[PDB]
Design a protein around this ligand. Structure first.
Ligand code: FMI
Length: 294
């Protein structure tokens, strides 16, 4: 029961070039399967997948986390909190088939990095080495957060993932991506207009839109704006709490600062629970398809 240690182990003989190839395959498929979710594309769901497979981590005993790639097991696969992520997993299936040597954890996390970068977000340094672990290492459902709570809940919840106020506010900025789907979470609507482009729009919308607390078709409360945008109760709590509000304003006024902070927090999130040997490769920074002329 003692807190186990997960040491990163580089996939046998693999290096930067090998992972850039996986990144490219993911990016090329993101470009090809552009019709998904009313042309939003698979970018957003891949980011959510990367986060959900990492967000089960508990700093107290190092259980859960991105290391094991346990989402491939039924218990986690069927977590109500992961409803809808099967689309992301299906997307990665052909990728894993072409590169069977990559671990599940590395693939799930790399999918998130690839999505953010291809959607014009900041570069996210990424490290390889996650190793698949047995089905009995799969964390129980209920470790992922709820969206119907307030700022105090958010702050306390994220302490389990060792994230502070700035890290939490920065991570939530990813909600500029995709949308909520009534069938998956009991919420409906997008947070903004640039559904598949990574920008700081989440913060601008929180501050500039005229929000009204309404009930959706699932009988859940959510904040709506005449522009057709929505915010979860937890999203809105970021402007209700004075400390979170200050940070929201900072990111709404500094795109570069948001990109830099999100990059650090996202990499941290994807690496929580992993021990990287002193002589492990330095983090990889993958070139986008655009940068490669592909
Ligand atoms: C890594 C960034 C990130 C973080 C940190 C983070 C944190 C948290 N998220 Fe969020 N998320 C991200 C990225 C990130 N999210 C993305 C990209 C989406 C869009 C998914 C899609 O469009 O398919 C979504 C969609 C989504 C939805 C709609 C799901 C659906 O109906 O398909 C809900 C209800 C929530 C709830 C919550 C919280 C508030 C409760 C778990 C929360 O704490 N999210």
């Amino acid at each position: 029961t003692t807190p186990l240690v997960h040491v990163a182990s580089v996939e046998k003989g693999r290096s930067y070039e090998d992972f850039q190839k996986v990144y490219n395959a993911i990016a090329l498929k993101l470009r090809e399967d552009d019709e998904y979710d009313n042309y939003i594309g698979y970018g957003p769901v891949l980011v959510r997948l990367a986060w959900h497979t990492s967000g089960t981590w508990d700093k107290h005993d190092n259980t859960g986390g991105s290391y094991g790639g346990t989402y491939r097991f039924k218990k986690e696969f069927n977590d109500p909190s992961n409803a809808g992520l099967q689309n992301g997993f299906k997307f990665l299936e052909p990728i894993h088939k072409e590169f069977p040597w990559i671990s599940s954890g590395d693939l799930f996390s790399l999918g998130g990095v690839t999505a953010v970068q291809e959607m014009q977000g900041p570069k996210i340094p990424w490290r390889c080495g996650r190793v698949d672990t047995p089905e009995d290492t799969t964390p129980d459902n209920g470790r992922l957060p709820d969206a119907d709570k307030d700022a105090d809940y958010v702050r306390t919840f994220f302490q389990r993932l060792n994230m502070n106020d700035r890290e939490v506010v920065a991570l939530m900025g990813a909600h500029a991506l995709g949308k909520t789907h009534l069938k998956n979470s009991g919420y409906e609507g997008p947070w903004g207009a640039a559904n598949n482009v990574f920008t700081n729009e989440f913060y601008l919308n929180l501050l500039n839109e005229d929000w009204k607390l309404e009930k959706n078709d699932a009988n859940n409360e959510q904040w709506d704006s005449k522009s057709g945008y929505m915010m979860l109760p937890t999203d809105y709590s970021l402007i209700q709490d004075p400390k979170y509000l200050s940070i929201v304003k900072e990111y709404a006024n500094d795109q570069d600062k948001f990109f830099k902070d999100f990059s650090k927090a996202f990499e941290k999130l994807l690496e929580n629970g992993i021990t990287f040997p002193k002589d492990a490769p330095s983090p990889f920074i993958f070139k986008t398809l655009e940068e490669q002329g592909l």
